[PDB]
Design an enzyme around this catalytic site. Structure first.
Site, PDB file in Angstrom:
ATOM      1  N   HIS A  71       0.724  -1.021   0.161  1.00  0.00           N
ATOM      2  CA  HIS A  71       0.558  -0.376   0.353  1.00  0.00           C
ATOM      3  C   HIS A  71       0.622   0.943   0.017  1.00  0.00           C
ATOM      4  O   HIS A  71       1.138   1.674   0.782  1.00  0.00           O
ATOM      5  CB  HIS A  71      -1.069  -0.355   0.977  1.00  0.00           C
ATOM      6  CG  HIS A  71      -2.428  -1.358   0.642  1.00  0.00           C
ATOM      7  ND1 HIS A  71      -2.351  -2.302   1.918  1.00  0.00           N
ATOM      8  CD2 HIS A  71      -3.383  -0.875   0.181  1.00  0.00           C
ATOM      9  CE1 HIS A  71      -3.259  -2.870   1.441  1.00  0.00           C
ATOM     10  NE2 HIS A  71      -4.027  -1.907   0.781  1.00  0.00           N
ATOM     11  N   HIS A 105      -5.955   7.112  -3.057  1.00  0.00           N
ATOM     12  CA  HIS A 105      -7.365   6.915  -2.112  1.00  0.00           C
ATOM     13  C   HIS A 105      -6.822   5.820  -1.234  1.00  0.00           C
ATOM     14  O   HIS A 105      -7.336   5.144  -0.355  1.00  0.00           O
ATOM     15  CB  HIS A 105      -7.571   5.709  -3.031  1.00  0.00           C
ATOM     16  CG  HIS A 105      -6.504   4.502  -3.255  1.00  0.00           C
ATOM     17  ND1 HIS A 105      -5.362   3.817  -4.200  1.00  0.00           N
ATOM     18  CD2 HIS A 105      -7.411   2.799  -3.176  1.00  0.00           C
ATOM     19  CE1 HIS A 105      -5.307   3.247  -4.535  1.00  0.00           C
ATOM     20  NE2 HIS A 105      -5.708   2.131  -3.717  1.00  0.00           N
TER      21      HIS A 105
HETATM   22 MG    MG Z   1      -6.814   1.063   0.677  1.00  0.00          MG
HETATM   23 ZN    ZN Z   2      -5.657   0.917  -2.840  1.00  0.00          ZN
END
Ligand code: MG
Ligand code: ZN
Ligand code: JIV
Length: 313
Positions: free
Chosen positions: A68, A106
């Site tokens: 991430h 995001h």
């Molecule tokens: Mg996420």
């Molecule tokens: Zn993501």
């Protein structure tokens, strides 16, 4: 004003395809994103000085976690770019502007932990946001960066246009909470099949943009097999770290997050492609036919995980 971004020929051609990989040279990812905004939106959508300052502040607010991270952000924005370019006429000027920014933002300030671990740890963010904990944090970080001096890329928009775009970005980012995906896709399934689906109904668009966000967020499963395989290692490196932390709090983690169940990864990928990915790209292809290559690529990688189980790799 007369300043195009151009990529080397292989990237210039390959970036238009759904399965494009942005490559390992971090320093090109900003340029790749600007290239995509210029071709998707126009060279006059954002002031270049403000956009670059915004891109670099967003990059700075992603953390060095296995999955991430900043590379995920630009990868999810590239997939959104391919969807928007292959569906030219179906999207407003504000949606084109908002959705690439939504994708880049995001997962802002992600720590490598699920909403579930935040709630079981009792992290302050879980008291501030009861549902879609990290996703409300991600939008909140987007608004913060937008409010830094020299960073309002939407400065040219009217008061109501600005509120419309921040609301597109908010729903887009909330929709990346996979807990919300199941019901969203179910509703879109029924609406498409009964013929009620109407792209002029703003609540129907919302749902359709929500599905696109899921599709972009899972797009690692739509890459060439070696990319899909190597990304899965990053995905599990986070999950297993979380599983370790669950055990530290005195809790058996779900098998997905238990590094003792390494050997069952191929079967877990099968479940995931069948329960989540395939349904997602199926419903998206029905609603948006020119996104079919994502479904086709997803099916190809499912078939690659079946081969791993059968000892053929
Ligand atoms: Mg996420
Ligand atoms: Zn993501
Ligand atoms: C793009 C992408 N995004 C997400 C959110 N995920 N989640 C997974 C885990 C799949 C899974 N593994 C297991 N384990 C059982 C024992 C060993 C493995 N169970 N499940 C359901 N994979 C992905 C991918 Cl590829």
């Amino acid at each position: 004003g007369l300043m195009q971004f151009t990529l080397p020929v292989r990237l210039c051609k390959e970036i238009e395809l759904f399965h494009f990989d942005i490559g390992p040279f971090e320093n090109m990812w900003p340029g790749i994103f600007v290239y995509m905004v210029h071709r998707s939106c126009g060279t006059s959508c954002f002031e270049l000085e403000k956009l670059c300052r915004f891109i670099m502040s967003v990059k700075k607010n992603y953390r060095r976690v296995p999955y991430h991270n900043w590379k995920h952000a630009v990868t999810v924005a590239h997939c959104m770019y391919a969807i928007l370019q292959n569906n030219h006429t179906l999207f407003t000027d504000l949606e084109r502007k908002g959705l690439l920014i939504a994708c880049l933002c995001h997962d802002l300030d992600h720590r490598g932990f699920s909403n579930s671990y935040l709630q079981k740890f009792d992290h302050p963010l879980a008291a501030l946001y009861s549902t879609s904990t990290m996703e409300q944090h991600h939008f909140s970080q987007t608004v913060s960066i937008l409010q830094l001096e020299g960073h309002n890329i939407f400065s040219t928009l009217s008061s109501s246009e600005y509120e419309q775009v921040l609301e597109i970005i908010r729903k887009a980012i909330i929709a990346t909470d996979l807990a919300l995906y199941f019901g969203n896709r179910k509703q879109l399934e029924e609406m498409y099949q009964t013929g009620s689906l109407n792209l002029n109904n703003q609540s129907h668009r919302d749902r359709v943009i929500g599905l696109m966000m899921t599709a972009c967020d899972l797009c690692s499963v739509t890459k060439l097999w070696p990319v899909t395989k190597l990304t899965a290692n990053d995905i599990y490196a986070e999950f297993w770290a979380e599983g370790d932390e669950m055990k530290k709090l005195g809790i058996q983690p779900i098998p997905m997050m238990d590094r003792d169940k390494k050997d069952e990864v191929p079967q877990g990928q099968l479940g995931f492609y069948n329960a989540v990915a395939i349904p997602c790209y199926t419903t998206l292809t029905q609603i948006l036919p020119p996104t079919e290559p994502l479904l086709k690529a997803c099916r190809d990688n499912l078939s690659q995980w079946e081969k791993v189980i059968r000892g053929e790799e």
